[PDB]
Symmetry: C2
Subunit: 295 residues, 2 copies
């Protein structure tokens, strides 16, 4: 009954990312290659302002990127707060495959990338520089999550061999403090893959996904018998109960999780309405809208 | 019956660290303050070569520190790959209490620390500089963890009010690649605290704890009803399984988990013999030896 291959990715642009991943998956390619190829599309696109090139800089005007990748056999790679490299997901893959470590950050991440042949490039576009200088006038930090403003791309897939893999990449919260790291490059937070169970990736206010260890929770729930959708929903309800305990207002928080199990069943859920995800399988590619907690 | 206050910490030096934490706990102080005070003792000690001052540098000769802290209400703070600040656990607490973020790395972490009044200091002792220059002769990276090598400090406590908190701090793997980050500053990996369940902290080959999201797993298992000891053991067993699946040899890996639940019950487990932990409660401070998987 397994439905494969299949790939899911976050937000409207995930539809286009899915097309690139499908080029690999539909030919029997590895899920690891498919998710890297898929998110690289968004990293390359200057018009996608929260991932790679064209990404909004931190408050010091520096574009620093974060990404992690995980394959079908517990191999992982991650880079955080790395500058000048357009495709951090690929540097993360290099960290995974070419070093005895699983996470490199800052200057050291760039140094490694360069040693691997990646090319130094100016990721700050004229548009981002302009918006940043404009923002500096009042310096009001107010993280907003949606197709406009903040987002990231997380992608998970099940290939023809029945193997799962995932990738997550972003330029992080616009105008963040220099050196700030969100959930996208943290294994178990922005992304988690267990080949015997399923995979999950999250998007939204990263700080909240980190404090709840979001994707590890989603996958563990699937391990405990929950369907992908129920797992995403239960995880969200956990951020909800936690958010209330911290005396915070749910309206100020947005998080979405998408998940896939070993059988190719998928699901998603979010705190607030307005989040969407793209799914591509034998029925084609489309954008779907999940359930939400804040009624 | 609830055993509180109580504090547990990793490795033999955890015994002396517990004495400092007990100064706070025995007076009815907050668990958050107790664990910060406890691990700061080790950060301050130049003779403890894998934590703060005196910590062995990365392969380029730079001492870069990592740490995270978590209180009783899901508040978290973390710094990774930060230089020149002797007490990263305290900068981590500042990230938690004074910023809209939960993790700062590299230059940005130092800049923030300085803005908060922390003082820049030379963390590379003459001894560490000497050993590093000696190591450079052959530059053979050999990740060694045991009773006398790479001993990070993770500390978790349950105070008189019945609240849990934890802290984890280290200088990382000796001669690591510049920018390498392990499990110590990652919430859900090196440390995790849920006041309605329990807390857990890890030590050892960090890469392995990150890939299994170790402490979140330990706490989630306690949520499912496992005793602290049972939870630590199963998390260790999950790493044992993954090491085998990745074609690696368990003899090259050491990971220890210690845990505490809301009732003050505690436990630990590790991969290889030789790992001890210290536990201090109203009956006294004890060096205890948990069970290990590698027979």
């Amino acid at each position: 009954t397994t439905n494969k291959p299949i790939v899911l990715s976050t937000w409207n642009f995930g539809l286009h990312a899915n097309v690139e991943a499908w080029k690999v998956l539909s030919k029997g390619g590895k899920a690891l290659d498919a998710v890297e190829k898929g998110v690289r599309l968004v990293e390359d696109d200057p018009t996608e302002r929260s991932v790679g090139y064209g990404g909004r800089p931190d408050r010091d005007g520096r574009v620093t990127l974060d990404a992690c990748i995980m394959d079908e056999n517990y191999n992982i790679g991650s880079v955080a707060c790395m500058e000048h490299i357009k495709n951090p997901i690929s540097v993360a893959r290099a960290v995974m495959e070419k070093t005895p470590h699983v996470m490199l950050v800052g200057d050291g991440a760039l140094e490694f990338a360069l040693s691997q042949g990646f090319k130094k490039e100016n990721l700050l576009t004229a548009e981002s520089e302009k918006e940043w200088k404009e923002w500096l006038k009042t310096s009001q930090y107010k993280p907003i999550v949606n197709i406009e403003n903040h987002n990231t791309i997380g992608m998970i897939a099940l290939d023809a061999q029945g193997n799962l893999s995932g990738a997550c990449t972003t330029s992080g919260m616009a105008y963040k403090m220099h050196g700030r790291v969100g959930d996208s490059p943290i294994i178990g937070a922005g992304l988690f893959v267990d080949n015997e169970i399923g995979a999950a990736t999250a998007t939204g206010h990263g700080e909240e996904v980190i404090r709840t260890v979001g994707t590890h929770l989603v996958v563990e729930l699937m391990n405990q018998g929950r369907t992908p959708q129920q797992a995403c929903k239960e995880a969200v309800e956990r951020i909800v109960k936690i958010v209330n305990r911290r005396g915070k207002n749910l309206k100020d928080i947005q998080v979405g999780f998408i998940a896939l199990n070993k059988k190719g069943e998928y699901g998603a859920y979010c705190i607030q309405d307005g989040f969407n995800f793209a799914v591509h399988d034998q029925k084609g590619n489309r954008l779907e809208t999940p359930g939400f907690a804040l009624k």
